[PDB]
Write a protein that binds this ligand. Structure first.
Ligand SMILES: [Cl-]
Ligand SMILES: [Mg+2]
Ligand SMILES: [Mg+2]
Ligand SMILES: [Mg+2]
Ligand SMILES: [Mg+2]
Lengths: 241, 196, 204, 244, 240, 231, 243, 195, 219
């Protein structure tokens, strides 16, 4: 039964190491969500600092890949940082070679192709991570593209990743069934972040303090993460209506 | 080419002429020799156009990748990357680059990298073929902690003289101002600076 | 010293009405010394004809190289290569030796088997294509050939009119070149017949 | 490390057999039967396609018979993809030889080269062997008309008539019975088709399930000509020989 | 990091089976149905856009890919494996052909090159076979219209019409009854839509079906590959 | 058990069995002792013969004028590692005109041994080394294990029955450390130490091997009748 | 089963058992700690005196990287040295290109990516150490801890080895009782105490205390070893607290 | 080396090659054989740079002898000449080119014809009724152009060759110390010991 | 060669002459010097022709592959970069001198690329042996934001200057007009010289040439 140890086909046409890499994805017990506004793309993720001895400022699963592209990771931090460093390198090389900023979906495809190689070549293991790339692309506008250990990728109107992804997914599905549009019809990113947090609260059935969340926002020509105080301001506005 | 960078109270200003020659033919009379390697780290280029463009593009790449990993690089860091490329490939390069940048901690800084690939941190720097004609003028007229308007005048008057005497320099005087306030581009036409 | 004029010789190609012609002298020399009067410079791969002037070792080598490549082409493609396609193959093959080139002057001639369209082409030693409808010239008497062709040539000549035009262009050009002559061959090429004629000329 | 997963494709069994070669030969025994028959005035290559369907485009299809050059062809039995790797290598070797010596490659020299490549995969590199057996039909001016076979071991042998693929035992007995040395191409065509017709696992032998080729020195002007038969031409020769 | 996998991971078993190729074919079997039909004046290839989530934008996932202006490809099996084959096929069409001959490869040769890549993943060190079967449709001047299937082994066959993946056995029977040598392209599209409806469970419309043709030139010459729009599919579903 | 097939595999309790098995080869080897004062450092080694016709296997190897070691375990592995030390000592002298510090020599040996414990295909070294030397910070004694663990000590012993000599040195610690400017008395203490590890056999003229290095003493090895004085 | 025999193999859980087995080697090692103070960091380690024959103060365990970074580890000591050698190469190439000394977070990721790389292939073994490291850069003090998986985070206090639970509890008290912060000299004293308290898990053999520190005020942002009077003062403070 | 001549008559090929080896100031040898037998019916004469000539000839000899053993067959003169040309053509773009000129005289046993190939150091191959390398042709070709007939006997070929050598001995400044003459025909290769 | 380009209100206008020479001899009087890079980007070439032809073809091919992967039209900056970086790497040994003009998502851009790998981004440029003659016309009459037919005439007038005053330039005038809404490839835009008329017919009568032997092989 060595067809379960390396990335070769089982008799059922399956790759068990890929399947088990998907399971490693949920090892952090963190859920992430991504939505698109008119002018922006918002990504939120749960933040859990279980140890008092940790410096909470260094505990992060959101990465600033380039100026325009943000990446949230669902999976263990070593593989997350492996993927983060590579995506940064790829995004910088691209800009040098081709003279313009790497689009979000082009990076996603590139990282998905790298992941595909680990599913076909035996000496390389898959990374135990799901990568959600976000930007406001100059041609395609607000963009969400997600990559997994199989080497699959696709664009999203919105998405969710983690142990409780189904609950979040259905909550988002039900909202977009009402509105009948592919985005959050809102001018300011502040309110799109408020939407994202509110709908995560509703879906998970848990309240959040400023230290329980982690937020990334993509606008035209920059991606940035919010501070605890910027998130607190967001939480105050939610509670006041 | 006539290029210079000058530190002042609020930061640093880079200046350059716009003439690019093939022998005696002016191949480009409106050249932009002030090139951006990071938000508030720019450089003035002299020497081989191919070399200094290639170098500047490589540096921009290095600092972009630096920024993704470690945050905003210092001007010293930028100068070091320029130096590394210029020194290690001295045999195959003809590049005389001035690196200027604004930090909030360090304020305005100027580094000059001549032909050999050495680095020299200076209050101001001059370079290019036209610089020879203004060593006297610039040394007599430079003061530290000048105002923005004084430094613009100092660069305008200096490059005016460099252009007047050097056939390889000419056209418009471009400038780039680097302060806490942001990045301002300035241009000065012949009819303005020739009558100074 | 100059590799392109050690051995000497010329090629010319022309288009006519539903036909093409390609012709060459037969000389091979070592500078002043005449060595061979049977050194043909035109080769064919299926219905595509290739003339090559210049350094004779490269002429031979390139013929052998294009025979190799067009044979494999045919086995894979299950059809004979066409003049337009072959022209690109020559260009590619020459340019891959950009900084150590073959000192040659190739000329392609042929009729496209499907469209029936007459085709001729020429290249510099590193592969730049000269794509001209009237005529292509090459070799140590290329200047002489340009002169002859420019004044003798007119469009849409019938095969036997075209034979006389290209022959007189070759012969009279060769006679004003020390390193060309010693016999001459002319191919008249139609869609499904090719006539090869050896010309009588002065042997000095 | 990696040793754990290594099948060791280039080892002897305790009996002195090469496991992978033997198992590759087992694979080849299930492939469609290919037959080669050598006559005084030419060579016949006949081969049966496997698992045909009505919707297969036959006139543009080639799985069995391949051209190596103008003088030499091959009939394939085994993995078609594996065969195409080797075929392209053989086509190159023939052109290398032609370039070097300005003469067409003698049949045996090409056969030995391909067979040596197959041999290498059994002795070094740790890779699986090519699951292919070839029948080589060719002509040169030294030995005239020649038939060879090679198998995954890299062993090759010469033949007057031979089969590879499925039911070779049965096929070889039938060929051994009816073959004679003074035989001609037209007779050999008939023998090849009759042998396939009796050994086939299909209900009947039809034009759509066959590939056919002849190498005949006879030609106008005495030149060797290879003829890969078209679907309609296979249908005609089946009627002529009285099989359909 | 020493890639120690220098040996084959696909080997012959005692019965003469290449296990990993068979298992790759099993992975293709599980994959969503795709088909191809050849007409007199064109070829059609089609498949279902099996969307993994309704929040996913299935337009961003292309199952039907342009390889050259006159050649298109569809698959059944593992999507990521298909994607890298398309990238390599697009590249090989330039390096091993267009940069040499100044024209795009004929369908059969581009298929041959893809087939070679797939064969090598079946024999080379430290790799598994590709878990896809491709259907490649195309046109070229001297061969006309053609349709090919390529399997994990590297074997390829030309077809008048065929299907691969989930409901291929039923679909191939359906095509055998309907196919003739006098079909126009519109007739072949109609038959493709009829055949594909049988293997689709849920929604059957222009947004859930991906369909492309190799046909006339769309105005050097115009490309013959054309992907049909969502609206163009729905128009032909009313005349169904 | 299932985790001892190669050096690249941890056991479930976090052990490296191939390294532990390499450590076992040292225990099978013949006893050797190391000890030092503030002025001198001494190696004593019990050499082992194959039979009465054979020679006694050499145990001590000179690495430089100021440094050398004694071995216990696979002698060819000691040859590899002592050759590496010779080269590193030599590099330090040629490039920097500097005698290689004993502590830095230990660090280099550790790192060389480590690479063989973390990579596939290789094997750990199957030998233990006692390195003595006199450098700019005085006399030094090191113990090398092929796990990579190098340790600076006043005295020690490795090989079969080495525990007896090690206990003796642990008792004598306060005495032998004070033997300054007296090479013969320090060697006596080393010969008396190694004697606590003998059974059945005793120290003969072709059995015993001694080495010394010190303040005004280059690394020199004594064998044959040169050690009869100490028997 | 068999998923634990080869590194880089995912078990059905999604775990890499070889990395988890490397953690056992870390847990078997001696206690080492790190304390982040007001303008720097303090490192301390337990050194077991196996025998009287060990020369006191000579077998130094804490290692400097560049001039501003301290590294200490628990587990397989050679594996730690190998990691520090790499760290020194990473810090050297960073400074060569960028002139400035490597920032601590930058340095942390260099070690992180290297350790993580040793979980990607079956041809290598994971690191049998958890490494506590840090120092002072342009943005102030930083303390990190890096595990065999390649996982690392920033810490207020950190502990690893056999006595880690004891040490962690002590560190948690300091964090609670000093929200405003701890001085460098206080952190040295507290580091001594915590090692002495954590020595109850290794109580059979006696031990030797080793402390180092980087502080902006006390060492000019350079890594230095605590020696002589300041070390003895910390030992005395530690001995007083256990009695 | 200096003079190498070749003439193809009715039923044989005759190669004539000078005996002198000069190293600058002195004539070191006057009996040097500037030829190698490649196969029983194929002879190659050579002239060019010192060392390279013999090195090249022996290298070719070795390869043809290897071919002969492998296939138990003698390659045709045309095949050997093509092989030789390719080796020289390969050589001319090398780091250090073989500066060697050759004549290949062979009897084709299949066609029952003598064949003479001339190949210079660039790989310039021509089949000829008579050939030479260096300055040898300048003196001799006018005589060969006048007298040569394709139906000549071997004895007539040797006489025409004597006339060529006499002209060379009269008008060439260098003393090449006469020529060794060898005949290649259906029976193989033999040396004319009196010339 | 005279090649030129300008930026006008709606896009790019490129122009080129048609003379190709071998030494002082004209080998082709109607050579196309405007090259396709991508559907929205074209290149005018001067310098060593093989180099220009090959370098443009290679970058065009690589851009095609890039564009298939990204699913969007390529940009002029990426065409500029790829050309520039390659030319720089070969240190001027590939003597490609280009005028690169196209229209992006970000608008119309015009570059001049030199053999050593330097580029200039400009509203108007000229290259080849006729650059000075062409540039004189631009310096005389260019203004920014010209209308299409005005820009067309200026480029044509610039190429004409090169044709007449430069011996290395001649033949017809070719244009390429690029905008968001269209691509017009005008070959030839103008024919400024009539081909010379020959007064006599010098073509020989059949049988004039002396033939030794003939052979006819059918196909
Ligand atoms: Cl990619
Ligand atoms: Mg794998
Ligand atoms: Mg001026
Ligand atoms: Mg003449
Ligand atoms: Mg004459």
């Amino acid at each position: 039964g060595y067809d379960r140890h390396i990335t070769i086909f089982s008799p059922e046409g399956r790759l068990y190491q890929v399947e088990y890499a998907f399971k490693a994805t949920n090892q952090t017990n963190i859920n992430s969500l991504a939505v698109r506004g008119k002018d922006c793309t918002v990504v939120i993720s749960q933040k859990k600092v279980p140890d008092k001895l940790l410096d909470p400022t260094t505990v992060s699963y959101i990465f600033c890949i380039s100026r325009t592209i943000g990446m949230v990771v669902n999976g263990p931090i070593p593989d997350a940082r492996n993927a983060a460093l590579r995506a940064k390198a790829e995004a910088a090389e691209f800009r040098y070679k081709y003279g313009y900023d790497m689009p979000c979906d082009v990076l996603a495809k590139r990282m998905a192709n790298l992941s595909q190689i680990y599913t076909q070549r035996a000496y390389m293991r898959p990374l135990g991570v799901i990568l959600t790339f976000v930007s406001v692309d100059e041609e395609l506008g607000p963009s969400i593209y997600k990559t997994d250990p199989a080497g699959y990728y696709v664009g999203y109107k919105a998405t969710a990743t983690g142990p409780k992804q189904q609950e979040i997914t259905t909550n988002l599905e039900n909202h977009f069934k009402k509105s009948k549009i592919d985005h959050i019809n809102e001018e300011s990113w502040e309110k799109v972040v408020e939407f994202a947090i509110t709908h995560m609260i509703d879906a998970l059935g848990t309240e959040f303090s400023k230290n329980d969340l982690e937020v990334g926002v993509a606008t035209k020509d920059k991606f940035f993460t919010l501070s605890a105080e910027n998130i607190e301001e967001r939480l105050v506005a939610i509670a006041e209506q | 080419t006539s290029i210079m960078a000058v530190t002042f109270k609020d930061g640093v200003i880079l200046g350059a002429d716009s003439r690019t020659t093939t022998g005696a033919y002016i191949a480009n009379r409106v050249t932009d020799k002030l090139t951006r390697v990071h938000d508030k780290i720019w450089c003035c280029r002299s020497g081989s156009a191919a070399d200094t463009q290639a170098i500047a593009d490589i540096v921009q790449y290095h600092l972009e990748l630096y920024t993704s990993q470690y945050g905003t690089p210092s001007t010293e860091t930028a100068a070091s990357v320029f130096k590394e490329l210029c020194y290690e490939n001295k045999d195959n390069l003809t590049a005389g680059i001035i690196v200027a940048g604004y930090d909030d901690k360090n304020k305005g800084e100027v580094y000059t990298i001549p032909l050999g690939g050495s680095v020299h941190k200076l209050p101001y720097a001059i370079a290019g073929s036209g610089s020879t004609f203004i060593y006297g003028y610039c040394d007599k007229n430079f003061r530290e902690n000048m105002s923005k308007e004084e430094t613009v005048d100092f660069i305008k008057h200096s490059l005016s003289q460099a252009i007047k005497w050097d056939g390889s320099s000419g056209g418009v005087i471009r400038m780039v101002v680097l302060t806490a306030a942001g990045v301002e581009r300035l241009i000065f036409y012949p009819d303005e600076y020739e009558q100074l | 010293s100059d590799p392109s004029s050690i051995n000497g010789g010329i090629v010319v190609a022309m288009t006519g009405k539903d036909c093409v012609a390609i012709a060459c002298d037969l000389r091979l020399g070592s500078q002043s010394l005449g060595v061979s009067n049977k050194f043909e410079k035109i080769f064919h791969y299926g219905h595509v004809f290739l003339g090559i002037t210049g350094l004779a070792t490269d002429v031979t080598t390139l013929n052998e190289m294009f025979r190799y490549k067009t044979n494999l082409y045919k086995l894979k493609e299950e059809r004979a290569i066409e003049p337009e396609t072959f022209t690109q193959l020559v260009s590619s093959s020459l340019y891959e030796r950009r900084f150590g080139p073959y000192f040659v002057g190739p000329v392609v001639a042929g009729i496209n088997s499907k469209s029936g369209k007459p085709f001729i082409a020429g290249f510099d030693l590193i592969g730049c294509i000269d794509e001209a409808k009237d005529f292509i010239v090459s070799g140590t008497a290329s200047d002489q050939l340009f002169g002859m062709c420019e004044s003798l040539y007119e469009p849409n000549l019938e095969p036997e009119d075209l034979f006389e035009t290209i022959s007189q262009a070759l012969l009279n050009a060769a006679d004003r070149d020390a390193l060309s002559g010693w016999g001459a061959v002319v191919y008249i090429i139609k869609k499904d017949e090719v006539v090869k004629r050896y010309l009588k000329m002065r042997q000095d | 490390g990696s040793r754990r997963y290594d099948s060791r494709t280039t080892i002897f069994s305790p009996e002195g057999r090469l496991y992978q070669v033997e198992y590759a030969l087992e694979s080849i025994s299930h492939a469609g039967t290919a037959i080669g028959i050598m006559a005084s005035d030419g060579i016949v290559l006949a081969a049966e396609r496997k698992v045909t369907s009505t919707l297969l485009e036959q006139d543009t299809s080639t799985e069995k018979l391949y051209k190596l050059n103008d003088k030499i062809a091959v009939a394939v039995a085994g993995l078609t993809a594996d065969a195409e790797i080797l075929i392209n290598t053989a086509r190159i070797h023939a052109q290398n030889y032609l370039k070097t010596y300005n003469e067409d490659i003698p049949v045996e020299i090409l056969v030995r080269r391909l067979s040596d490549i197959k041999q290498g995969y059994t002795q070094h590199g740790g890779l699986r062997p090519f699951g292919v057996s070839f029948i080589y039909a060719g002509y040169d001016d030294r030995y005239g008309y020649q038939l060879y076979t090679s198998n995954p071991s890299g062993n090759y042998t010469g033949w007057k008539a031979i089969s590879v693929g499925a039911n070779t035992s049965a096929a070889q007995t039938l060929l051994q019975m009816d073959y004679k040395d003074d035989m001609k191409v037209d007779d050999a065509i008939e023998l090849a088709l009759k042998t396939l017709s009796k050994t086939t696992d299909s209900s009947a032998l039809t034009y759509d399930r066959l590939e056919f080729a002849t190498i005949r020195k006879g030609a106008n002007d005495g030149e060797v000509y290879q003829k890969i038969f078209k679907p309609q031409e296979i249908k005609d020769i089946l009627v002529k020989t009285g099989i359909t | 990091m020493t890639d120690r996998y220098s040996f084959s991971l696909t080997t012959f078993s005692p019965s003469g089976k290449l296990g990993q190729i068979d298992y790759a074919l099993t992975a293709v079997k599980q994959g969503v149905t795709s088909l191809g039909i050849k007409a007199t004046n064109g070829v059609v290839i089609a498949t279902e856009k099996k969307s993994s989530s309704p929040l996913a934008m299935s337009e961003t996932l292309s199952k039907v890919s342009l390889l050259t202006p006159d050649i298109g490809a569809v698959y059944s099996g593992m999507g990521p494996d298909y994607r890298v084959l398309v990238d390599k096929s697009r590249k090989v069409a330039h390096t091993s052909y267009k940069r040499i001959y100044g024209e795009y490869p004929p369908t059969k040769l581009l298929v041959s090159e893809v087939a070679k890549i797939m064969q090598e993943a079946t024999q080379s060190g430290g790799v598994r076979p590709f878990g896809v079967s491709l259907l490649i449709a195309g046109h070229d001047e001297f061969n006309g219209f053609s349709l090919y299937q390529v399997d994990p082994s590297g074997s390829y066959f030309p077809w008048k019409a065929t299907a691969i993946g989930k409901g291929s056995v039923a679909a191939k029977t359906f095509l055998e009854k309907r196919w003739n040598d006098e079909l126009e392209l519109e007739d072949a599209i109609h038959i493709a839509l009829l055949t594909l409806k049988e293997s689709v469970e849920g929604e059957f419309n222009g947004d859930t079906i991906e369909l492309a043709i190799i046909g006339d030139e769309n105005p050097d010459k115009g490309p013959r590959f054309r992907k049909l729009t969502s609206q163009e599919i729905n128009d032909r579903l009313e005349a169904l | 058990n299932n985790y001892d097939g190669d050096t690249v595999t941890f056991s479930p309790t976090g052990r490296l069995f191939q390294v532990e098995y390499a450590l076992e080869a040292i225990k099978q080897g013949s006893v050797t002792v190391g000890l030092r004062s503030n002025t001198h450092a001494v190696l004593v080694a019990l050499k082992r013969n194959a039979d009465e016709l054979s020679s006694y296997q050499k145990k001590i190897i000179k690495c430089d004028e100021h440094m050398g070691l004694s071995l216990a375990g696979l002698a060819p592995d000691a040859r590899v590692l002592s050759n590496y030390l010779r080269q590193q000592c030599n590099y330090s002298s040629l490039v920097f005109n500097r005698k290689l510090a004993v502590e830095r020599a230990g660090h280099l040996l550790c790192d060389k041994a480590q690479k063989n414990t973390q990579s596939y295909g290789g094997r750990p070294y199957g030998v233990g080394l006692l390195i003595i030397g006199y450098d700019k910070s005085g006399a030094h004694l090191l113990e090398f294990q092929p796990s990579g663990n190098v340790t600076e000590l006043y005295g020690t012993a490795i090989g079969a029955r080495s525990q007896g000599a090690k206990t003796y040195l642990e008792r004598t610690l306060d005495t032998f450390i004070k033997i300054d400017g007296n090479p013969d008395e320090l060697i006596k203490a080393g010969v008396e130490a190694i004697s606590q590890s003998l059974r059945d056999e005793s120290l003969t003229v072709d059995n015993l091997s001694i080495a010394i290095v010190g303040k005004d003493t280059p690394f020199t090895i004594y064998d044959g009748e040169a050690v009869a004085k100490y028997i | 089963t068999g998923y634990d025999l080869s590194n880089s193999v995912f078990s059905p859980d999604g775990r890499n058992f070889q990395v988890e087995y490397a953690v056992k080697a870390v847990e078997n090692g001696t206690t080492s700690i790190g304390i982040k103070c007001n303008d720097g960091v303090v490192f301390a380690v337990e050194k077991l005196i196996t025998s009287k024959l060990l020369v006191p103060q000579k077998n130094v365990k804490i290692q400097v990287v560049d001039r501003h970074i301290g590294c200490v580890y628990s587990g397989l000591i050679p594996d730690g040295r190998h990691l520090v050698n790499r760290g020194r190469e990473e810090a050297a190439s960073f400074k060569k290109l960028y002139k400035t000394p490597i920032p601590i977070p930058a340095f942390a990721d260099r070690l992180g990516q290297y350790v993580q790389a040793h979980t990607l292939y079956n041809s290598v073994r994971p690191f049998g150490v958890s490494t506590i490291f840090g120092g002072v850069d342009k943005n102030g003090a930083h303390l990190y801890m890096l595990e065999p998986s390649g996982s690392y985070w920033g810490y207020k206090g950190a502990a690893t080895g056999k006595g880690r639970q004891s040490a962690k509890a002590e560190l948690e008290k300091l964090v609670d009782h000093h929200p405003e912060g701890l001085s460098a000299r206080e952190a040295v004293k507290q580091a001594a105490k915590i090692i002495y308290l954590a020595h109850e898990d290794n109580k059979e053999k006696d031990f030797e205390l080793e402390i180092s520190w980087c502080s902006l005020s006390e060492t000019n942002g350079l890594h230095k070893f605590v020696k002589g009077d300041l070390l003895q003062e910390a030992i005395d403070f530690a001995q007083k607290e256990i009695n | 080396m200096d003079i190498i001549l070749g003439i193809r008559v009715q039923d044989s090929v005759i190669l004539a090659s000078s005996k002198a080896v000069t190293r600058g100031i002195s004539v070191l040898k006057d009996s040097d054989d500037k030829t190698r037998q490649l196969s029983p019916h194929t002879l190659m004469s050579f002239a060019g740079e010192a060392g390279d000539t013999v090195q090249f000839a022996e290298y070719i000899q070795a390869n043809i002898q290897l071919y002969s053993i492998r296939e138990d067959y003698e390659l045709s003169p045309q095949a050997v000449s093509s092989f030789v040309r390719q080796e020289l053509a390969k050589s001319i773009r090398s780091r250090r080119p073989y500066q060697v000129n050759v004549l290949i005289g062979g009897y084709d046993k299949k066609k029952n014809k003598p064949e003479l190939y001339q190949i210079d150091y660039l790989g310039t191959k021509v089949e000829l009724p008579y050939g030479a390398h260096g300055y040898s042709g300048f003196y001799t070709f006018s005589l060969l152009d006048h007298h040569y007939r394709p139906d000549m006997t071997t004895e007539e070929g040797l006489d025409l060759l004597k006339l060529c050598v006499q002209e060379l001995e009269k008008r060439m400044p260098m003393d090449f110390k006469g020529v060794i003459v060898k005949i290649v025909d259906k029976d193989g290769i033999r040396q004319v010991d009196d010339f | 060669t005279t090649i030129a380009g300008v930026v006008y209100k709606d896009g790019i206008v490129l122009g080129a002459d048609t003379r190709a020479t071998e030494g002082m001899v004209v080998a082709d009087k109607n050579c196309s010097k405007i090259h396709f890079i991508s559907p929205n980007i074209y290149c005018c070439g001067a310098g060593t022709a093989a180099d220009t032809d090959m370098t443009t073809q290679l970058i065009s091919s690589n851009l095609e592959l890039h564009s298939l992967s990204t699913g969007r039209l390529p940009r002029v900056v990426t065409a500029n970069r790829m050309l520039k970086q390659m030319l720089f790497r070969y240190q001027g040994y590939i003597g490609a001198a280009l005028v690169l003009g196209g229209v992006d998502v970000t608008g119309p851009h015009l570059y001049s690329i030199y053999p050593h790998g330097s580029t200039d981004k400009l509203p108007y440029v000229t290259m080849g042996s006729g650059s000075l003659a062409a540039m004189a016309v631009f310096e005389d009459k260019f203004r920014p934001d010209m209308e299409e037919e005005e820009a067309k005439n200026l480029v044509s007038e610039a190429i004409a200057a090169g044709i007449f005053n430069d011996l290395g330039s001649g033949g017809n005038i070719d244009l390429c007009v690029i905008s968001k809404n269209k691509l017009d490839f005008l070959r030839p835009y103008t024919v400024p010289n009539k081909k010379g008329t020959r007064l006599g017919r010098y073509r020989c009568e059949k049988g004039t040439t002396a033939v030794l032997t003939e052979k006819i092989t059918p196909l």
